[PDB]
Symmetry: C5
Subunit: 199 residues, 5 copies
């Protein structure tokens, strides 16, 4: 049934179409687990970090009966709709470090969690402070407003490399909504706050 399931997903799902249920927004969960902090610059206020970007959402049309079938499959993301998330204050392309496969569950829920390396512009002052710096990253949909996509956040140092020259103090995630000057609509995002200190 596993090739069957991939087949059913590809015949049934269009990657270029938002899986909106009954003209409700598509609820996406976003969550970052930091793995490393590689380059910090206090003169230019730029940081280099590696993290797992956990992204989950639902496409109920994908679902299948798993009484005698596998409960899950791994699928190339090029066969799915994936939300067009962006980090607003990113100053580089995000470098994907892991195979780009999503996990689909028989109920129609999807998990995509690449490990990503990326550079951001953010407040770095206090890095050499026992209070540490707090760097804020904002992530949301680039071209879908809140009527279509809604972004909700789900040991902060649990998988953090210990060989990093930095140490994490806390990670906190909060939901925001913003309307920009060019356009009438609002865009939901998550601000992740990364509190870290040099060692």
């Amino acid at each position: 049934d596993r090739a069957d399931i991939l087949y059913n997903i590809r015949q049934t799902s269009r990657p270029d179409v938002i899986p909106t249920q009954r003209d409700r927004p598509v609820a996406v969960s976003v969550s970052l687990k930091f793995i490393n902090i590689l380059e910090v610059n206090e003169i230019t206020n730029e940081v280099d970090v590696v993290f797992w970007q956990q992204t989950t959402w639902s496409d109920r049309t994908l679902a299948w009966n798993s009484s005698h079938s596998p409960d899950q499959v791994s699928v190339p993301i090029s066969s799915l709709w994936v939300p067009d998330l962006a980090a607003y204050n990113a100053i580089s392309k995000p470098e994907v470090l892991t195979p780009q496969l999503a996990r689909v569950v028989s109920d129609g829920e999807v998990l995509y969690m690449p490990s990503i390396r990326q550079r951001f512009s953010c407040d770095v002052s206090g890095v050499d402070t026992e209070s540490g710096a707090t760097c804020r990253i904002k992530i949301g949909s680039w071209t879908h407003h809140s009527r279509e996509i809604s972004v909700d956040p789900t040991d902060d140092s649990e998988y953090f490399s210990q060989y990093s020259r930095f140490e994490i103090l806390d990670v906190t995630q909060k939901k925001n909504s913003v309307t920009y000057s060019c356009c009438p609509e609002a865009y939901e995002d998550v601000e992740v706050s990364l509190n870290f200190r040099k060692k």
Copy 2:
């Protein structure tokens, strides 16, 4: 129904044909919102900047009925005709940092606004004074002259990063039309004047 709207587009879009409309030029709007200034060099006169390149134009073929269907949708740009804009004094290709989706309205109006990192050759003198420097970026079509394509420009620190170590004194944008030595036709560009200084 968002799916039915998109198939229609995929069927009739013609990515390689200017939606020219009866030998009148396509009227393109171009507008930059500077987001960050990352590096500057007074001796080489080079600049590294991140900006939103907002681009709008009409494709009539793309229109549909929004009465019982949605007003607009996100489309991959690989599925559309896109203006062949180039920045004349660019010295790198643009690194596109965001998903390459454009917004298409049922009236055929297309919005495409990517965050872009690029490096330019321009006048950096003054960057360390209070008066600041004035760097000019020129954007036009590369292969469509005045009759085929027209570009028109349409708060300057509204989206600028507060963690940048530069700041914007003013942004101004004026239209222009130039004939080159090689060929008789004229080309339109938008001239953008970034007046900024080191904080």
Copy 3:
């Protein structure tokens, strides 16, 4: 059967997007790293840049043919094949693959893929100047298939005379790990590269 015939059949039966499980059991991937070079280390940042042959074998019994009177093996580009989704967990760059992306398929269905790879890691570089030397640990495991669908197991001679470093020992350990977020276990091979400066 000729080489063309074998490739034709592989293209007819291969399904690059779908794991080739035998009934119930997990695909048993084998992995061993053969280190060729250690190019840049940083004692301050704890980052290494290494070159290695990633020898990877596994079985896809659907590909099999009778080779009594035909070739026993062919080379196939990996896009024609299902390949395991292995990741180095503590890598901080993509793998630069240096060799032609070709796999070797045996008539019984065994597959061998062994790319030469240059990659950068985040590991312990302390003591690289010491007699004890440094011990960098590289962790490799399936990224999206848990232990019931993929298992990985471990299977200095070709290390460059010209590197600025010498190898002391290379050991491997198997781990199985369930993570905070998700209910499954994921297997990996931990390789320990014990090296020091000449």
Copy 4:
């Protein structure tokens, strides 16, 4: 109709087939910037417009009651396999890779390119200047299949650390040891100096 002209092109251009009587290719470089110079390694980094023209009569159409010119993606056209022999990086193409096609089958491709070369940089701080020679030619076509013909500080950047004294172009034929066919190249000479 402009759509109609492209449709015709797609089913009329064999991108893999040269259209021949050697194809006559015109090459000229208009320099936009000199970005780096390294007097010790003899390396230069430059930005230039590559004007490339050639005829593809197979592509022609009727100009009356018809648009005289269209913009076409080069991926859909044959294009000369030009290469710079003293290049030491791949060309970064800074512009959209579209050609323009006239109704009489004349073709224009003029990308903006950044590229690094190995050439003589001695004298760049001299009043006389330095003279950097770039040689361009077809890589796999000999004289009987392709000839290259060559057709100023005019578009050169005011903000460059350097200025152009003179640009000159010559034609050459060369036979290499490996193969007995002849290859034509246009040698472009750049006399420039630090201001």
Copy 5:
């Protein structure tokens, strides 16, 4: 000439080694060194530019000699999967990726390549200089499938000078029972 490309597209099998009978494909390789660009005697690494002349025969491509040759995209043809074992970067190919095809089936591919190698740089400044050896061979075809058999274009603006030899070698590795043929290129050069 359009017809020849049509046939080649028609009969050419890019993924299938074109072995005749039971014998291996004879691949000729030779490097023409054009430029040595960087050198690091500390790390023993070099960055060079060379032309790689690679030639071999594929008879599924032949035509009744119409002109003798045509230029083809290598994407249209089987190409030998040579790799340089002591490479530490991917090849950066600087020329159009086009192969010349003779009517008899001879194929010639010669790109200009820029690559960094790991080799012996010790003494490059010395009168003796250093000597880098670049080993080149098929990565996944053993000696029964592929056999590999082996200075006037150097740039005068290079900061380096060349005092070049080529040798055949055949290697059986610990993992596997077959032998892999290679060519070792030996290059003695010093700082100018």
